[PDB]
Each structure stands twice: as structure tokens, then as C-alpha cells.
Design a protein around this ligand. Structure first.
Ligand SMILES: [Mn+2]
Ligand SMILES: [Mn+2]
Ligand SMILES: [Mn+2]
Ligand SMILES: [Mn+2]
Ligand code: NA
Length: 347
DNA sequence: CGCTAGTCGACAT
DNA sequence: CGACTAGCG
């Protein structure tokens, strides 16, 4: 996420209802509904007991969107991203820790805290996601497993005109360059839409409302790919970019002390890390549903050389990418767990 | 005022 | 994979 981004650009938001997008296509960051639905049956999942509450939970939202005349395209997280593997190790070990801690707190008699500790152990498997996938295919709803992060895939689907809005709880989508993002949507359709064009309404941003500058700001504040410098948040980063009349961000990051009046030392790790983060936001591998090909989020600029972008996602053969995207190929074992075919029945 | 970092809701009975 | 809020620059 970009910590505190929503309240920072709150002036560009607008309370709406999804009825607004009737007769149009909307992509969904399904992990949110998956997580929320998985909260309801934390004990069943932790113990390993069979359950399918989260499926119906997601299907409520899906059927709702279908009822209001929307065509939803559920998008799911795929393979792990190397840039994001630190946090994905942290969350893992913490999940295990709270799992065992809850298992022990079950024996104290404090069942009230064992379940709260089971809440911090929710691990959304790809099998659950695939249950949701078949459940969605039942009502003739298209699904798409991102080659890596769902964020990038959604961003592409939005910037390519395939969808007109994105349903998520994550503010990362704005940093990826989404035109329209619908946050905090309930089971009835009440949501909070953030439009990119309205970023100019935010006084705090100043002239930092262009996609590139906005990206730089979000990265400088601290993201999932690169932790920020101690004492650097959204406001100070935005201040840096505002006071900086320089197309070359590197020298600016170097003169961050001159811009912020703070004696800040910039390590050599942070420059490379910044270029890493920017290249991750720009050229993370997504999946084209039309041409059925593995492509970066944005077209490669002459500035960067793709050979040094393994962290932004590794390429594979397009057929395998297709079988992953359909959910037919297991993300982990790479073995065929299903055989759905859109040919013999978005693409 | 701005930022870090820890707490605790989210679902829902 | 988030919204607050105290505690500190
Ligand atoms: Mn995030
Ligand atoms: Mn995501
Ligand atoms: Mn994200
Ligand atoms: Mn400027
Ligand atoms: Na920060």
C-alpha cells in the first residue's frame, strides 16, 4: 500500500454507487473479498476443517454487480514477486507465529483471544481462489489470474480500456496509474471513487498530480518494494518533488537534504532500490487477455534495458502464461489442477 | 504540523 | 493485506 495515501488525497474522492457504471466493465481485486470472507471462518481454515463461506461471501458481491448491470472481471494474485518477497516472508512467519500462538491460547480457556489470534493467520491459498474461480464461472463471470501481482494486472486492464473502473481496498492501484479506483465498497454498492483527473483538486499535491511525479512521491513515501528513509513520508516527498525543477529524479533524491532542510544521508542501496521500485511499478509483467501474451504493464521506454528486470517478473512461454491466467495451472506446483477452456465454449 | 510504529477492526451473532 | 493515534522531530 502507500501508507496514508487515501486521507492525503481525500479531496479527490467522491462517494458514489456502482450503478454509475451500468452497461460497463469493471475489474475486481478479488483478494479483498477473499480475505474478508475468510475472516468469517478463521477457525475452520486454521484447523484445516472443510468450509466454503468465503465463496458465497464473494458471490454476494459478484451477483450484486451482475444485478446492477455491471460486467465484473475477477482478478487474482498469481506468483510471488521477487521485489515483494521480504514482506511476503514477514507475513508468512507472522502468520505461522500467530497460528501456533492461537493453538496454545486455545488451551488456556481464552477462546476469545485464540480466535483473534486465528484472525492474524489467514492465508489465502490458490485453491480457495480457484474455488471462487469456478463459482464465478458458474454465473458466466470471467476470471483472470495475474502472472504476479493483481495490482499490475488491474492497472493494465484499466489503462488498456478493457475496464473503466477498478474495485479494490488497496491504494497501490493509484500509483500504478489507474484512471478510476473504487475503494471501500459494501455488499450493496456504496463506494468511494477516486479519479486520477481529480488529483488536481488536492491542494497538498500542488503540481504533483502527473503520473510520473505521483509515482515518484508514492515510492519516496515508502511502498511494498522499497522502505522509505527515516523521517520521510508523503508530505515531505511531495515537498521534494514540488521544490524540484528537475526531470532527473536521481540527482533530486541525492539533494533531498537541500530540498527538505534535513541533514539526510542517502545510501547507495536506496538509489538502486528506487530505480528497482520505479521499474516494478512501470514494467511488471501482466497478461494481455486479447493477444494472449506476457507483457510489461507499460511499453518499454528507451531509458531502461529489460534484461535487468528479473525482479519485475520473469518471462515464460505464452501458453503457460495462459494456463496460469485461466487458473488451470497451479501457481505453486505448476501442475494442471483444472482444464477450463474458453476456446471451446474477454478473450 | 509531519512521521514512525504499534494497536486493533474486518465478519458477524 | 488498513485505519487511528499516541509519541517524537
Ligand atoms: Mn500494498
Ligand atoms: Mn495486491
Ligand atoms: Mn498492493
Ligand atoms: Mn516543481
Ligand atoms: Na515513510
Amino acid at each position: 500500500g502507500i501508507q496514508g495515501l487515501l486521507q492525503f488525497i481525500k479531496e479527490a474522492s467522491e462517494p458514489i454507487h456502482v450503478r454509475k457504471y451500468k452497461g460497463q466493465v469493471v475489474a475486481v481485486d478479488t483478494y479483498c473479498w477473499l480475505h474478508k470472507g475468510a475472516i468469517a471462518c478463521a477457525e475452520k481454515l486454521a484447523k484445516g476443517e472443510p468450509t466454503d463461506r468465503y465463496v458465497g461471501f464473494c458471490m454476494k458481491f459478484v451477483n450484486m454487480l451482475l444485478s446492477h448491470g455491471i460486467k465484473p472481471i475477477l482478478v487474482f494474485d498469481g506468483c510471488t514477486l521477487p521485489s515483494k518477497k521480504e514482506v511476503e516472508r514477514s507475513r508468512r512467519e507472522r502468520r505461522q507465529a500467530n497460528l501456533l500462538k492461537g493453538k496454545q491460547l486455545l488451551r488456556e480457556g481464552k477462546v476469545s483471544e485464540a480466535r483473534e489470534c486465528f484472525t492474524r493467520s489467514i492465508n489465502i491459498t490458490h485453491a480457495m481462489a480457484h474455488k471462487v474461480i469456478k463459482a464465478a464461472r458458474s454465473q458466466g463471470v470471467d476470471c483472470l489470474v495475474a502472472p504476479y501481482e493483481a495490482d499490475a494486472q488491474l492497472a493494465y486492464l484499466n489503462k488498456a480500456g478493457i475496464v473503466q473502473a477498478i474495485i479494490t481496498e488497496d491504494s497501490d492501484l493509484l500509483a500504478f496509474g489507474c484512471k478510476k479506483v473504487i475503494l471501500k465498497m459494501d455488499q450493496f454498492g456504496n463506494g468511494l471513487e477516486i479519479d486520477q483527473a481529480r488529483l488536481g483538486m488536492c491542494r497538498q499535491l500542488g503540481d504533483v498530480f502527473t503520473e510520473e511525479k505521483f509515482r515518484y512521491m508514492c515510492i519516496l513515501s515508502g511502498c511494498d518494494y522499497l522502505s522509505s528513509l527515516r523521517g520521510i513520508g508523503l508530505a515531505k516527498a511531495c515537498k521534494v518533488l514540488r521544490l524540484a525543477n528537475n526531470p532527473d529524479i536521481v540527482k533530486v533524491i541525492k539533494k533531498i537534504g537541500h530540498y527538505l532542510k534535513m541533514n539526510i544521508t542517502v545510501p547507495e542501496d536506496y538509489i538502486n532500490g528506487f530505480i528497482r521500485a520505479n521499474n516494478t511499478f512501470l514494467y511488471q509483467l501482466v497478461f494481455d487477455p486479447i493477444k494472449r501474451k506476457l507483457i510489461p504493464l507499460n511499453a518499454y521506454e528507451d531509458d531502461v534495458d529489460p534484461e535487468t528486470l528479473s525482479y519485475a517478473g520473469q518471462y515464460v512461454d505464452d501458453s503457460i502464461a495462459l494456463q496460469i491466467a485461466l487458473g488451470n495451472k497451479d501457481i505453486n506446483t505448476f501442475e494442471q489442477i483444472d482444464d477450463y477452456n474458453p476456446d471451446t465454449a474477454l478473450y
